[PDB]
Amino acid sequence: HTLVWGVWVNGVDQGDGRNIYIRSPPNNNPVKNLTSPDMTCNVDNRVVPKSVPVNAGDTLTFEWYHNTRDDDIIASSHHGPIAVYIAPAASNGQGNVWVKLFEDAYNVTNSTWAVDRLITAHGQHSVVVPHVAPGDYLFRAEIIALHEADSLYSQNPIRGAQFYISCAQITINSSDDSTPLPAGVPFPGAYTDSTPGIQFNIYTTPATSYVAPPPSVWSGALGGSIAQVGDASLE
Ligand SMILES: [Cu+2]
């Protein structure tokens, strides 16, 4: 159970974004139904009043939390990967629009899941803002908790992969558009019962064998990190 509190831009806190520039759901419960309209931007997808201004090449940091800011972030049980997607805001997340900017699943070198490193990072993970056309975008941050993913939700609705999905309203101002955004995947639709990485048993299958759900990270993506960019406690 986790939510996005707000974002940082080049290490500058943009402040509480909940129901302001984040399309916040009413609570931290996961989405589990892969064919749900809720897979797009969680259960309360609507235009919120603010879009965070950034330029291509800025470091954009998502900050997650559990109950209160800078707490346990997400239950340590919730091992799994983190991805970030982008879509043009005019799409409302509908259609073949979601382009993957970031993937981190299981790090063999460190022996840790992305979620494990997200807790250590006080809920902070970042992307480089891509050189797409200036305009309004949705950045869809997605944590998959796999602790109950041995079952498909479609076979046992009490279990299944848990999607913590948060859509941030970002406005890209300065961008040379050196990497025009292509068409993407649909949510719901990109993940099905047979998609690699959706049905996985963390108790019995080594994390070294885990393959995150496609799609692949876009050739235009400039990278990211799971690491604390800003200290919420100084505020
Ligand atoms: Cu949970």
Do 127 and 84 contact (CB within 8 A), yes or no?
A: yes
Say if strands 52-54 and 162-172 run parallel, antiparallel, or are unpaired. Answer: parallel
CA 164 to centroid of ligand 1, rounded, Å = 9
CA 32 to centroid of ligand 1, rounded, Å = 11
Do 168 and 4 contact (CB within 8 A), yes or no?
A: yes
Tell me how crowded residue 23 is: count the other CB atoms within 10 A of its CB.
26
122 annotated as a binding-site residue: no
Of the CA atoms within 13 Å of residue 196, those in its CB half-sphere come to 9
CA 12 to centroid of ligand 1, rounded, Å = 29
**Total H helices, total E strands in the chain:** 1, 12
1 annotated as a binding-site residue: yes
Cα–Cα distance list, 133 to 93, 101, 137, 186 (Å)? 17, 15, 10, 20
164 annotated as a binding-site residue: yes
DSSP assignment, residue 194? T
Do 119 and 89 contact (CB within 8 A), yes or no?
A: no
Question: Shortest CA distance to 34 belongs to which of 138, 185, 142, 160?
Answer: 160
CA 220 to centroid of ligand 1, rounded, Å = 32
Q: Which CATH class is domain 3-234?
A: mainly beta
88 Cβ neighbours under 8 A, 6+ residues apart: 97, 135, 136, 137, 138, 181
Do 147 and 203 contact (CB within 8 A), yes or no?
A: no
CA 1 to centroid of ligand 1, rounded, Å = 3
Do 131 and 84 contact (CB within 8 A), yes or no?
A: no
Number of residues assigned to the chain: 235
129 annotated as a binding-site residue: yes
78 annotated as a binding-site residue: yes
CA 10 to centroid of ligand 1, rounded, Å = 30
Do 81 and 113 contact (CB within 8 A), yes or no?
A: yes
Structure tokens, 85: 């997607």
The β-bridge partners of 128 are 59
58 annotated as a binding-site residue: yes
